[PDB]
Amino acid sequence: HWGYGKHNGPEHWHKDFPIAKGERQSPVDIDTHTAKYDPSLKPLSVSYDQATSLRILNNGHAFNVEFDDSQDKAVLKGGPLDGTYRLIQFHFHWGSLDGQGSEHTVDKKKYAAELHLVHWNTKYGDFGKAVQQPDGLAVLGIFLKVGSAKPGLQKVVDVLDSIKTKGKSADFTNFDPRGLLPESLDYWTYPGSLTTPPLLECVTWIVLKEPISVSSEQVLKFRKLNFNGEGEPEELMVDNWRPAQPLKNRQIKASFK
Numbered sequence: 001h002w003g004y005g006k007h008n009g010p011e012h013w014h015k016d017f018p019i020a021k022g023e024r025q026s027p028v029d030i031d032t033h034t035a036k037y038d039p040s041l042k043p044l045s046v047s048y049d050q051a052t053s054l055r056i057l058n059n060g061h062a063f064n065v066e067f068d069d070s071q072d073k074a075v076l077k078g079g080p081l082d083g084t085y086r087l088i089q090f091h092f093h094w095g096s097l098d099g100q101g102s103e104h105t106v107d108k109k110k111y112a113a114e115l116h117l118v119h120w121n122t123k124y125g126d127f128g129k130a131v132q133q134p135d136g137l138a139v140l141g142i143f144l145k146v147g148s149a150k151p152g153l154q155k156v157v158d159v160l161d162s163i164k165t166k167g168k169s170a171d172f173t174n175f176d177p178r179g180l181l182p183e184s185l186d187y188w189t190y191p192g193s194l195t196t197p198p199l200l201e202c203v204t205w206i207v208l209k210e211p212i213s214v215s216s217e218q219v220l221k222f223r224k225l226n227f228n229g230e231g232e233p234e235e236l237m238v239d240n241w242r243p244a245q246p247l248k249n250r251q252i253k254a255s256f257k
């Protein structure tokens with residue numbers, strides 16, 4: 001099945017998921033000189049005061065921090081969005097080395113990692129129905145650079161030892177995702193897709209300009225996770241990023257001058 005290695009990595013995905021070569025695939029390179037300021041964009045509204053995390057799971061590709069999405073508790077609205085999008089999970093993509101790991105790039109620059117906060121459009125009732133729609137998802141993407149530690153990340157780092165291998169999960173209640181946000185909500189936005197199979201073209205991407213800083217010790221702990229399951233040969237979970245895809249007939253808009 002699909003993964004990130006020589007034989008089942010991104011260059012193979014199109015055989016099981018032909019939309020890999022579609023018209024609105026993600027990630028993309030953000031050319032900052034080509035992205036036009038759009039004064040009709042709104043500030044993003046990120047309302048995470050009532051977010052209820054439940055669990056963390058190693059799915060064999062990354063780890064997911066999952067939320068209770070059965071009530072309007074943690075929502076994204078405003079920005080380029082019409083309506084209200086509910087947080088369902090977050091996860092990261094990261095590298096084997098600090099010079100790579102992000103999926104979007106900025107003027108070809110790769111960051112050490114990228115956080116994706118995944119939200120679904122409540123007009124479609126559930127996440128499964130939302131991913132059948134071209135406006136079903138909104139993903140808030142946040143770059144990570146290595147430097148000072150991010151205090152708000154440490155509870156996630158410290159639980160990873162308990163979910164080393166594929167299929168492991170741990171209770172993960174009362175985690176506050178506001179601690180993962182940078183100061184500024186300035187962003188770029190474009191229409192795109194999931195960056196993992198099934199690569200569905202449902203996503204309004206909202207990519208923050210300001211990275212957060214994490215410490216080298218924090219990212220090193222991500223890199224001790226495993227893609228394999230318990231009692232299988234160890235394959236470190238690193239380099240779980242898809243490279244940039246063709247922009248095609250799309251425009252990247254900036255919320256800021």
Ligand SMILES: Cc1cccc(=S)n1O
Nearest residue numbers: 116118139193194195196
């Ligand atoms: C599972 C998922 C949902 C939305 C975006 C991305 S990159 N992923 O992986």
Ligand code: NA
Nearest residue numbers: 067068069070
């Ligand atoms: Na849920």
Ligand SMILES: [Zn+2]
Nearest residue numbers: 091093116195
């Ligand atoms: Zn992702």
